[PDB]
Write a protein that binds this ligand. Structure first.
Ligand SMILES: [Co+2]
Ligand SMILES: [Co+2]
Ligand SMILES: [Co+2]
Ligand SMILES: [Co+2]
Ligand SMILES: [Co+2]
Ligand SMILES: [Co+2]
Ligand SMILES: [Co+2]
Ligand SMILES: [Co+2]
Lengths: 386, 386, 386, 386
């Protein structure tokens, strides 16, 4: 069962299934894929759409006539399959010119180039129908303390994002930006290393409403953080504009395993949260089929991303709908967590002897939270052991 | 040399030098210290002041007459020594009533109690002259996914901080709040786990100007993050209201080693940043003399916190003042990082062929950043090997 | 379903369900349990037996008559319930005398005391029928580099274990030792930090056959290691004498969550390995019911340890027995991994042109490993989604 | 000062200074270096020698005549400069044929090829004068649990190392092997992930005396382990055959920073240990000049490796020779740690009432260890602040 269809809004980057398998220590294990072929194969699996960096769709340094032909062929594949392009992004990390950054490169000429490269691809993104434009500043950061003054770098990063906001406003485009945090890799430390840092930065932009976050499962887990909690804070802020789904085993290099691999229970709680909250954006996979795999394994790994999401969706929904779980949630006071602490106001709280002078602290301390029974019901639902 | 004096603004929590050595696996190794004795010993070492949780100064459950006598004795010790009290905080973590949180406990009665307990100690803090009131929500969080809906918890945390802001405004107090992030420990995951998450949260409070952060070296390092970078983002935001200095060896339990221990180069870059930026708040140590130590070792460890700060301050200042370093900084384009990317404006950037059509990407890529020579000058200055 | 019975050989430490909830930052949340009550409650749940540190069964400093009465009551509870005592251990970590270690304390008198304390409890262990005597040297290590010369400490640790081996041989006891590694906590770094380090150390003891390892899920995961892989190396070495089962979320303080919590897929692969290998020792839980819980939650958490093991056992067995999985294992060459590389011998390998001169490296490189399809069959079996 | 000369025995891999800067997310930033040029430049800096993988010296797939000419040119550069070749190794990780391993590949034909490739280069290593032959099994491991049975893989790894030992014995070569552990990267988990695991494995080889370890600073730190402690255990075992020096910031991708970068205090304690122990092998750097650098920065980074070792050597020697430190070491009972616990024997210990019945546990517990004063003397010596 668990068959995806385009209604499920699953999307994939061209660079995911198209990854040829080069790693720090290894040459490619697979031939390059034509984007047309990836669009056709992903549609066959039941994907809704694809995403791209500029340089995945149009080789870097292409002439205008080559650019036009690459876009024409890609548009034909989209039209042949019904696939969409909900998101696009810029490659500001592969070319050696970006070795110290794009928007926060120490060289000013590089910063200006990075902005022009981005702007060119925003126009293309809009042409192809994208609603979201991601920015992963993977080269923004440092290996050493003197190399990068972070206050100056944040000034440059704000100028860049503000210019991009002025550009989209000037053109009357509806597209919005999603900043993707990552704590490290390829830089020793990356600027805006977590969802929190990116959310905080956005509040200092001139038009914050144009910007949200694009969190990635594995990135927050590279800092040992709880990905569902970070997603909850992004949702609380109204800033979950896009999301990248994959798997990661804790604090390592970025593994980009298929979704559901890595921390399975975190995957369960993530799906539970997205579905509970009614997140309506793409469920995008930013993953890499391991380099051990041939093309059959690439498509199996892609299919597994979607299958795992659908299994988890079923189990999370069954958990929340189970009367026994609903009673356990009330036994654990989840209902009381959702009630205001002091809707009666400050002065009433100050005058309330039940809140201090007559609060029986020992009686309250003795009341168990019943969280372990609740969590074992969650385990039983995930495992199909009810 | 490197002798601290009160002008250096070094402060210590009562709970630091007063830690009796109990850990997850171990009983106390030292007798309790009277706060009067810690104030006298810290003053002898050249400290400027001390800080307290409510329950470090006044045992939990004290009568009004006991409270008054504890405060009277402490005030006498302050007056005898010239020590100040720049910061105070609430213990919302030790008593079993707070096992699921204070401000975000699932039990509403506990949330209301936590607020009353905090308010009582804000009044005391102001009496004692404190400018900053720290809040470390160490119990806010979860060990399991169903136990805590994070959006609801953030709603409760905002209500609590907003009520506290209304309280201080109503009283005409000048005190400001500093929220202390930590990623985990004692909860499996703590809410507001990093500086970024706390900065982002503050922007959603009703009176954000009343709130900043109190980052701790070891807390950000428990997420593998770069503490100087996070401090730079807090400074960029205008939110470094207080800071906690200590040492930590990476991703472990919170070690609370003396400042300078743990990541020494991060300590160097931190001091460089605080001094460069002209941070004018207390240099507060939140550390624990290891439980291996007797009282002589407690005071040696405290003295070492201050000594290490002063050594690092000298070395960072020598680095920045060295003409050879100044030339290396220009060779690495730190000066260009500090210049606006496009003060000429968006349309000029769009019309600038030097930024795209005529940008020689290969020439720019070939220019080395010279960061390793710069970093070895920094190493040589730190080690006194110039 | 998934009901444990004593035949399943599930065991629990007295200190697990008996943990009162004290943590670095918190007082006890539960009253102390009488060991008699824990034996009765665990038997009711279907446990096979219990384990103890000396000081969990007999309070430290007890008189001979108090000792005798504590043991008499415990033996009655064992006899009333049919519970066994397969393992015992020494507390060489709680009392302040052990603040720098037991066997590797810098103070020689402490080292000698630690040995006498251990020997006294080996005699008790044997009286109670234990086959395995665990040693977790949680205080062996350092917070600073000068405090502990590790070569000298390893000399002292070998002398201690050798003396213990001489003691058991002298008495004609059948009991064997199991050394429990942990990388850190409560010491900044603990000696013998992983399964590998402990296995290597054992090979240098005078009677290595008397010693094996007692790995704990969460301990190896505190170093980011793969617990099933480490168990496989222990099994390969013939040294898995005992095992501690629990849950952990990666690189943090030691969480001691119930088994199945933390890394669920690692729990699956662990059970698969133990069952495949025919491990016949106790399935022992070294866990802590979270301090949020009352006693009902303690017993629910304990029951969940056993339930999760039994669910995982069923799913792992179904995976290995599924003809589709068996075919996927052959497609991924797991059968070839189990065949000798060169049973033909060195000279034949050297003369084999198919191994070098005529090896078609490109054809071999092109053959996919089919690991993603295999892993998604494993996921489907774990989740009950076949 | 701190000028290295060949007497210092500093060595570098060709792949270190020759790294062109390709990373997971980035193309090369530097042109390829001819090994002849690296030998000349390293000699100019005061290096003693160089090391190589087969494929760094002779491009993969070279003809016999190309092989001979590459070796001839390299030998001329060695002879021109006086540089040595103390160590060599095999590249069993870059070519796609090794995507599942060399010695533990699931495909048997690949395992046999990996052995022939290694044997060919052992002969070359011996020709060039190498004493040590390193093996880093970077592809040995898995991303998923079903893909690799670790007991079977360890059987294959033992067969491979045993065959290599039979080969060197058959040829009468004096060369010995050094196994290099790493916990992860490029595989999700690597087999023999730490020094301990490798030491334990070696004890099960047929001729253990032929094998030791080649630990790398950053590899053990990728597991959060204490590198000096692991080196001490290797020295204790008599197995430190070679060492790789670099820098790493904790639990991340393998950074390969220059030695002294990353954890500076760990670098200090490492040098202290190597020098104290009289380690006489090469001080080999396995590092990567950051891709931000041009060739001038490559040579500056290489020079900094050696400079930092020499600074640390001076400071560690001054620490150990300082009478004040010597007295602090006795105050902390480091002398007592080095004395046998019970040279009087088991029966005397059992009969010694001072070890149990008459041991004043409270008096011993009250004696402070004085470790913080000792560690601040170590800090002061490292920083040149005495
Ligand atoms: Co990623
Ligand atoms: Co991504
Ligand atoms: Co802390
Ligand atoms: Co703090
Ligand atoms: Co544990
Ligand atoms: Co244990
Ligand atoms: Co490395
Ligand atoms: Co290496």
């Amino acid at each position: 069962n668990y068959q995806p269809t385009p209604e499920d809004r699953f999307t994939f980057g061209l660079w995911t299934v198209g990854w040829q398998g080069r790693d720090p220590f290894g040459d490619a294990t697979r031939r390059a894929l034509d984007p047309v072929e990836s669009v056709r194969r992903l549609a066959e699996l039941g994907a809704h759409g694809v995403t791209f960096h500029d340089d995945d769709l149009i080789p870097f340094g292409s002439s205008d006539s080559e650019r036009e032909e690459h876009v024409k062929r890609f548009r034909q594949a989209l039209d042949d399959t019904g696939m969409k392009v909900p998101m696009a992004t810029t490659n500001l990390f592969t070319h050696p010119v970006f070795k110290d950054g794009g928007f926060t490169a120490n060289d000013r000429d590089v910063r200006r180039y990075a902005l022009r490269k981005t702007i060119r691809n925003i126009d293309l993104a809009v042409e192809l129908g994208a609603e979201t434009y991601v920015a992963w500043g993977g080269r923004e950061g440092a290996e050493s303390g003197g190399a990068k003054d972070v206050r100056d770098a944040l000034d440059r990063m704000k100028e860049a994002f503000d210019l991009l906001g002025e550009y989209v406003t000037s053109q009357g485009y509806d597209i919005r930006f999603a900043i993707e945090p990552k704590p490290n890799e390829p830089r020793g430390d990356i600027l805006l290393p977590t969802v929190g840092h990116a959310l905080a930065f956005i509040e200092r932009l001139e038009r914050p409403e144009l910007y949200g976050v694009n969190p990635e499962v594995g990135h927050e887990q590279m800092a040992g953080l709880n990905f569902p909690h970070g997603i909850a804070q992004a949702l609380w802020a109204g800033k979950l504009f896009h999301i990248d789904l994959n798997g990661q085993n804790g604090i390592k290099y970025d593994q980009d395993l298929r979704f559901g691999a890595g921390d399975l229970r975190a995957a369960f709680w993530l799906v539970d949260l997205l579905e509970s909250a009614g997140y309506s954006g793409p469920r995008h996979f930013d993953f890499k089929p391991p380099r051990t795999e041939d093309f059959d394994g690439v498509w199996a790994s892609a299919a597994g991303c979607m299958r795992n999401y659908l299994i988890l969706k079923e189990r999370a929904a069954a958990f929340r709908a189970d009367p026994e779980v609903q009673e356990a949630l009330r036994a654990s006071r989840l209902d009381e967590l959702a009630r205001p602490t002091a809707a009666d106001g400050l002065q009433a709280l100050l005058d309330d002897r039940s809140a201090f002078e007559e609060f029986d602290v020992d009686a309250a301390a003795a009341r168990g939270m019943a969280f372990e029974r609740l969590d074992q019901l969650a385990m039983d639902h995930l495992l199909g052991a009810r």
